[PDB]
Amino acid sequence: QVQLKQSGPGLVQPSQSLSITCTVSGFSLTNYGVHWVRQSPGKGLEWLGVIWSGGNTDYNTPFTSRLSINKDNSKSQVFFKMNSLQSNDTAIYYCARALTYYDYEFAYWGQGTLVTVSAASTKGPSVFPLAPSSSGGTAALGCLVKDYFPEPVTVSWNSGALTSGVHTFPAVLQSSGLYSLSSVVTVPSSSLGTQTYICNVNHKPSNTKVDKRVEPK
């Protein structure tokens, strides 16, 4: 069906440019316009601009100077570029398509690109096990994803096959300037002997991809 898949989450240094690629499928860029919307702490949902079927572009008034949108119809790719970013440009940027080619009711969205504007350096996390031991036949276990920058980090269990009972807590910013979160899952104690439990940690900004096996100590 109709899908919009954006490029991976990124860190941008202050005063430098942001570049995002929106690859579409299920429709042709010649028949629909692609809009760009961001969601920031200080302004919430904000419409940035759009590239139409025929190639024309409109940019929202505060971005006419530093916003630039292009596309490659044959490759089904739309290219978002914004210049001279600052801290209040830290937001989740979406590409979106409307129901009709001319309208603005966005029925299809990209997964979003979390953009962090910071002078700090990228840092991959360390994954530590939260080992169960000796609750009425229910054992809790998890992984500690510690000391990474910037956000985000993806955590699944058993390559996605284990979702029931999973809780992935929001990241907390430590005093060191690095993020840290945990992901837990509750399982039957009896399964701890005949089942393997792996957390799949992936920190795309640092290309850190780690699978941690969590066993009873």
Place this chain on the structure above:
Amino acid sequence: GQXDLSTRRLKG
């Protein structure tokens, strides 16, 4: 009332 980047949810 503000949007939190860590959850895509409104917090305060």
Place this chain on the structure above:
Amino acid sequence: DILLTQSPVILSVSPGERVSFSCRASQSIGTNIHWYQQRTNGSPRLLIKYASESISGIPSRFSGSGSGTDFTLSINSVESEDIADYYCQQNNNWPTTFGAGTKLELKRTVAAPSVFIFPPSDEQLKSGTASVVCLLNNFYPREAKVQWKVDNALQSGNSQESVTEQDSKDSTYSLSSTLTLSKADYEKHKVYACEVTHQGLSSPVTKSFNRGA
């Protein structure tokens, strides 16, 4: 631009109840308004286009009404899966603008938490740092207190809490409290306790371990 004022900031109801979302425009925008749902870590989801028109794949309990400056999004029989933020978007005037949103919380019966304490791994101790984690699993309401003690010494300022959003199925919360110590500090002590205070517990629950066993 057009200012959209959503009201209230937070809505708290019980499953099966009726719930309405207010979106007021700074001037008449006719019916040119669209509603959006956004779950945790998700993208906006189109619920209603042009104040009242239905959207494909949207449950029939979602409907919208209103015209001019006062618009309403309604859920007749709200369900646990409806826990999300809800935004309105106008497009009668350029550029299209969004509201600030309304958070939809769901009331449910009190649930005592399941508490689990996790010692630091031997792997992390090699890095010169000890992290002790206490898990408060599937509880309601959100209010909860975690008290750390190290050899009966009250810990303060050296822990951080993280709380999940409401679960889409059982509407409960989960909390993780991480006590962080230097490895030297951790090795100088034995008893590591996590005391949990919650409305669903008649008495505080304490999970603890001794460093080593």
